[PDB]
Amino acid sequence: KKRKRVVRNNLRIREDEENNMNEVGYDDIGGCRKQMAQIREMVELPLRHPQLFKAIGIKPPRGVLMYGPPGTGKTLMARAVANETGAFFFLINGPEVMSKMAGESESNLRKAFEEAEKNAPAIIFIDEIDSIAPKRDKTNGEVERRVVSQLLTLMDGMKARSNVVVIAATNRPNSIDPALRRFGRFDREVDIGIPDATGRLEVLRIHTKNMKLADDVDLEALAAETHGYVGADIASLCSEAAMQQIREKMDLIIDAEVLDSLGVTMDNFRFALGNSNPSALRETVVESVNVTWDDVGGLDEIKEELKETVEYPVLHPDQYTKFGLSPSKGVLFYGPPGTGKTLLAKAVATEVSANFISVKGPELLSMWYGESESNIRDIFDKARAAAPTVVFLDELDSIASDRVVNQLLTEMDGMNAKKNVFVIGATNRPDQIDPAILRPGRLDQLIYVPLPDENARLSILNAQLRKTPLEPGLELTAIAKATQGFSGADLLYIVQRAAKYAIKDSIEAHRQDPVPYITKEHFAEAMKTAKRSVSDAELRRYEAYSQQMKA
Amino acid sequence: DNMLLVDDAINDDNSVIAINSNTMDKLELFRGDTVLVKGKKRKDTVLIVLIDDELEDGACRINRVVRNNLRIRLGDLVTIHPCPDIKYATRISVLPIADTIEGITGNLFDVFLKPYFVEAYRPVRKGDHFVVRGGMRQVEFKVVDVEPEEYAVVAQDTIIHWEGEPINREDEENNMNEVGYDDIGGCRKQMAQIREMVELPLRHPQLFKAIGIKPPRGVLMYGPPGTGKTLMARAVANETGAFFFLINGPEVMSKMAGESESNLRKAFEEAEKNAPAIIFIDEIDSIAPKRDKTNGEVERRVVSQLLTLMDGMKARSNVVVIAATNRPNSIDPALRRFGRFDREVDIGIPDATGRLEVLRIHTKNMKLADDVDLEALAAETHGYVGADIASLCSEAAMQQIREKMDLIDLDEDEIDAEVLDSLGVTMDNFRFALGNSNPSALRETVVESVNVTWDDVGGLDEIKEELKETVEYPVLHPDQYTKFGLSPSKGVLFYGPPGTGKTLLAKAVATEVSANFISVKGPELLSMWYGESESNIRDIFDKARAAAPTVVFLDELDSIASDRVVNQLLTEMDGMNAKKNVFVIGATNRPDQIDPAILRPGRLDQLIYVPLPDENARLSILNAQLRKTPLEPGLELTAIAKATQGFSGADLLYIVQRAAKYAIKDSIEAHRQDPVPYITKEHFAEAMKTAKRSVSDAELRRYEAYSQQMKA
Ligand SMILES: Nc1ncnc2c1ncn2[C@@H]1O[C@H](COP(=O)(O)OP(=O)(O)OP(=O)(O)O)[C@@H](O)[C@H]1O
Ligand SMILES: Nc1ncnc2c1ncn2[C@@H]1O[C@H](COP(=O)(O)OP(=O)(O)OP(=O)(O)O)[C@@H](O)[C@H]1O
Ligand SMILES: Nc1ncnc2c1ncn2[C@@H]1O[C@H](COP(=O)(O)OP(=O)(O)O)[C@@H](O)[C@H]1O
Ligand SMILES: Nc1ncnc2c1ncn2[C@@H]1O[C@H](COP(=O)(O)OP(=O)(O)O)[C@@H](O)[C@H]1O
Secondary structure, eight states: OTTOOHHHHHTTOOHHHHSSOOOOOGGGOOSOHHHHHHHHHHHHHHHHOHHHHHHHTOOOOOOEEEEOSTTSSHHHHHHHHHHHHTOEEEEOOHHHHHHSOHHHHHHHHHHHHHHHHHTOEEEEEOOOHHHHSOOTTTOOOHHHHHHHHHHHHHHHTOOOSSEEEEEEEESSTTSSOGGGGSTTSSOEEEEOOOOOHHHHHHHHHHHTTSSOBOSOOOHHHHHHHOOSOOHHHHHHHHHHHHHHHHHHHHTTOOOHHHHHTOOBOHHHHHHHHHHOOOSSTTSOOOBOOOOOGGGSOSOHHHHHHHIIIIIHHHHOHHHHHHHTOOOOOEEEEESSSSSOHHHHHHHHHHHTTOEEEEEOHHHHHHHHHTOOSOOHHHHHHHHHHTOSEEEEEEOGGGGOOOHHHHHHHHHHHHSOSSSOEEEEEEESOGGGSOGGGGSTTSSOEEEEOOOOOHHHHHHHHHHHTTTSOOOTTOOOHHHHHTTTTOOHHHHHHHHHHHHHHHHHHHHHHHHOOOOOSOOHHHHHHHHHTOOOSSOHHHHHHHHHHHHHHHO | OOEEEOOOOSSOOSSEEEEOHHHHHHHTOOTTOEEEEEOSSSOEEEEEEEEOTTSOTTBOOOOHHHHHHHTOOTTOEEEEEOOTTOOEEEEEEEEOOGGGGTTOOSOOHHHHHHHHTSSOOOBOOTTOEEEEEETTEEEEEEEEEEESSSOOEEEEEEEEEOOSOOOOSHHHHHTSOOOOGGGOOSOHHHHHHHHHHHHHHHHOTHHHHHHTOOOOOEEEEEOSTTSSHHHHHHHHHHHHTOEEEEEEHHHHHTSOTTHHHHHHHHHHHHHHHTSSEEEEEEOHHHHSOOTTTOOOHHHHHHHHHHHHHHHTOOSSOOEEEEEEESSTTTSOGGGGSTTSSOEEEEOOOOOHHHHHHHHHHHTTSSOBOSOOOHHHHHHHOOSOOHHHHHHHHHHHHHHHHHHHHTTSOSSSSOOOHHHHHTOOBOHHHHHHHHHTOOOOGGGSOOOBOOOOOGGGSOSOHHHHHHHHHHHHHHHHOHHHHHHHTOOOOOEEEEESSTTSSHHHHHHHHHHHTTOEEEEEOHHHHHHHHHTOSSSOHHHHHHHHHHTOSEEEEETTGGGGOOOHHHHHHHHHHHHSOTTSOEEEEEEESOTTSSOGGGGSTTSSOEEEEOOOOOHHHHHHHHHHHTTSSOBOTTOOOHHHHHHOTTOOHHHHHHHHHHHHHHHHHHHHHHHHOOOOOSBOHHHHHHHHHTOOOSSOHHHHHHHHHHHHHHHO
16 A cells, blocks of 8 residues: 555654654544545546546546635645656645746746646646636736746646656636636536535544543534534644643643643643634535424425425426426525524525525625625536535525626526525515526525414424423413514523523522523513514515515 | 842952851752842842841842842842853953943953952853952952853853943843733733733643643733733733844835835744744734725735744744734734634723722832822823823923922033922822823724622612623623523613613712723714725624623714614624623613614613603712812701702702802802812802703603603
């Protein structure tokens, strides 16, 4: 393996060894099984077995291009695949080549390409290819027009029939000159999103393989609580926890006995999480959700309609092809705020096992005003790249000009119907929605979301209270019955208020477990201190609009 | 207990230390061998030990000169070790000090060679100062160099060299190459954090290897300009004792292209050679500014070279990089990612104790007059960073010079020393200098500590308890919330009549949890909206995160209800993680223009009405103001409180101020024509006759209706 206890170490199955951080195989990467498989398919076969392509008679693809949030291990993934396949790895940095003189950058590039070619089982991993080749309409300088031209000439002049694979990494997909996306160049696109719970647990296990972890570790709990953390953030969290442990042990301070007492505890991880701050949520990213249909309460007919709309076309594409009906993709939820529309969207995305994409109203406004990292083009491009995907547009009424609406219409119409990309819009103000978006071939289907009934309210209360202690024998049927006209947000507020009262009483009792659960009287006080958040006028308006649509 | 207590010595011998036999017994030292005494700031010396039965056990006898050389004072603890590697000196180079040879010429080296080194075998070390008597003078020389290393003893056959020129004495003191922790004050927390982030990687690298982790390398301290960042960096570097290397942003950026890369590469390589080492930078923003505004290629290549050097740093090497920047967000964001500058430290304006400590440090050499009340200056000086305090001291000294100048004649080239002896800075000089100061830190959002308690709050007990339950518990008792799973709320918004004590409530809340208050007025938000202001709300929240726990205060939040700033605030507040100890308190007199999105869950959801003070509240407020102005004995404030229905705190304070003004005017008239240094009944009578209300009843009814609507 890798072209290689003492024998096992020799065959890999004083600083010069550890500092030489190589041989990082597939073991040291987690949460990217799909992308790992894609990269392996596009790399190993062209290099290990070029004979197969000759047998089938077709040129193997070469141009690969990865993009995702910064610090997600793109460089680490490329290094790992290069080491696993056993080929020579050449690394290039965009700013570095841009750093050198006007003519020096072109030299560097051509010399690197030729050196790879002469020694060319290898991967020429560019990095931050956007910097060297930014958008043409933005920068049109002499050096900008020269270095990009040289790179394009080198790419077009690829000798072919060789074992050279070029990989480029850019944080944003549509942040490069489009000239690189044509045939014979970077075409095989790969998207890396924030890892899910399993990926985060894998990363935690990978990193915490040398640290003297204490006896009490519940890494599953850490994975569950940590959301929106990229691998770099997890590494930083582990480092912060170790630093906190060192600080805690420092009060008593070296004798080896104390060194023997070093141990990272759950308190350290909690403190590190407190000190950590993810930098990935601020950008639109693709992830996987696991919301079950049984998770929500009621809305059985809505579930049936959404199933008919999404599941059958994707579960049984052959039936639709034979019947000739193209899959529907325009779904728009409307109804009172806080009715769990996002939860329904997440359930729908989980049904087809697609990657859910979320774009909120503040993001829409930021794009509208021009101050925003990403534009709708990038959102839809990523949606296509990570197909299948379900895009969610929250508060379409918040774009109340029409530039963003026009861009959205163009993007929605341009994408091919066959591609499994669905768009789900949510808005509590259907009147304000531009009529142009309701046209056929667009967000045409309308789904009203009625308020939960007593059964739905009881189910919501039961689900929300599963993870918190409750007084044995408590009957929530009365609570649900006495909560007519409410919504999910109101029930959540009631639960939070009851928990707050319980916390206050517990703290006072401890100062003076006396009460490790919430009593019926606490819920009674919470409900008496809270009331409905939606007036009858709004419900009447919703009903009138529903009648108008029906008629 | 090998440490021994520093003791004053009557004898003037510069190489003899007299100790009791029990002192040797503790360390089992043998008579006839020198000992190494090490003090502080990497200062050490070698002394010949003698036995003095008179001295009690543990009592030493070292002249004042050796202690001065070691930079130590009486009563300190110094570590004493034997000298197993005693060696003699073969070639010692020593040069004189010109100011020490004033009044007598000639070469005293030959005079001192034989009598002073007649088989004496005095131990010698680099940098020592030794005093020898020649003629009528006692001249002190310095040990320029000694061979073989490291310290050795002055043997008779040792060759002494004197080919050179004298050097100044104060030049070494002003070199700034020796500054310990004693030369800093008011930054205990930040200094402790820097020590924890620096000492452990260098002093004890084995800890990280034992626990299996890569120690951090990137420490970035940012704060208002002229706050002492460079001084703190130099102090920590010298205290650690490791090799040091500095890079100035202005210097590197001032050289033509290409030379900068060579300088950076040479600096990094040389520092790596002398591991352990510390690399420091200044105005890193200057060399790596915000790429969004500067598109020049030179800065791009410089920043790329710096990034390459940082990333290529070898895994195991005792090198720590420190950077300084006034604006935390000004630097190119690429430097903030993992594996680079990540350990962020924020330095705020010092509080009263910090200002007192700084003033004490600076006023360590001036001829302070007998009447100085540095406590009063510390209390009065608010918003002064250390540099402003140094400028204040300089200006006060200059004013004293102005006052004393008339006696002397500046035309002559010589000034009599008797007048010089009379120089002395009086409290009036400091008062004038403070009058002619120009603080600037307070003009921009800077984290500062507050010391306001519930006592200053005149009533609103129920609001006090509600706010306590909302804030204090999640800050001091997160365990209960974790057990129940309820997340802590952060968004609290006060609404009510102006001047009802909202800022004071926010300050009290911030003080209770012992957090760093941050203030952001509405005009600042407007200027940020127009872009004229330097700092952006992103910077405010980044500073709040770095200085956590903190309480941010947004006054006149309705002034932006503009939409870009509101959207940015919503985005940043959403990005904030709940578990972090960051809280936001909004204030506004018009709780109707605020966008509904501000009131959404996970945002400024908690609403608190602030009512006008009650009669008991009015009495408490009046008592609170009347603490430094003397009052007529027997004066009754109940009549004023009861006749001041509907008044606000600001109105009561204004009434007190105008009454004090009337009393002062009466005193001025009486003196011109201070038997009455206090206020009497007539002044309060006039003030109440001139009383009014800041809020009309219609506005009160509107607020009441709005509060009832919110409650329903
Ligand atoms: N499976 C993983 N996914 C993400 N990060 C990982 C993973 N395994 C380890 N890491 C850690 O996360 C970081 C990923 O590598 P690195 O810091 O080079 O990020 P990157 O996104 O590839 O970098 P860049 O985009 O600048 O080339 C490293 O700290 C690596 O140790
Ligand atoms: N404890 C202290 N805290 C702050 N300033 C101090 C302190 N002691 C002395 N000073 C004064 O502060 C100044 C030293 O800090 P300096 O001017 O280098 O700060 P800076 O603005 O961070 O520097 P830089 O030019 O490196 O950005 C001198 O005026 C010194 O007299
Ligand atoms: N079956 C359900 N119906 C309505 N709301 C639910 C249901 N299940 C959970 N919820 C709650 O609904 C909330 C979603 O709130 P919100 O985003 O305001 O709704 P929307 O996105 O539809 O406007 C979640 O916090 C969740 O706890
Ligand atoms: N409980 C209180 N209510 C109102 N004012 C008070 C109270 N305690 C003290 N004050 C005084 O009232 C004034 C309030 O000023 P400020 O905090 O700016 O008010 P606001 O935030 O309402 O504008 C200050 O002089 C303050 O010392």
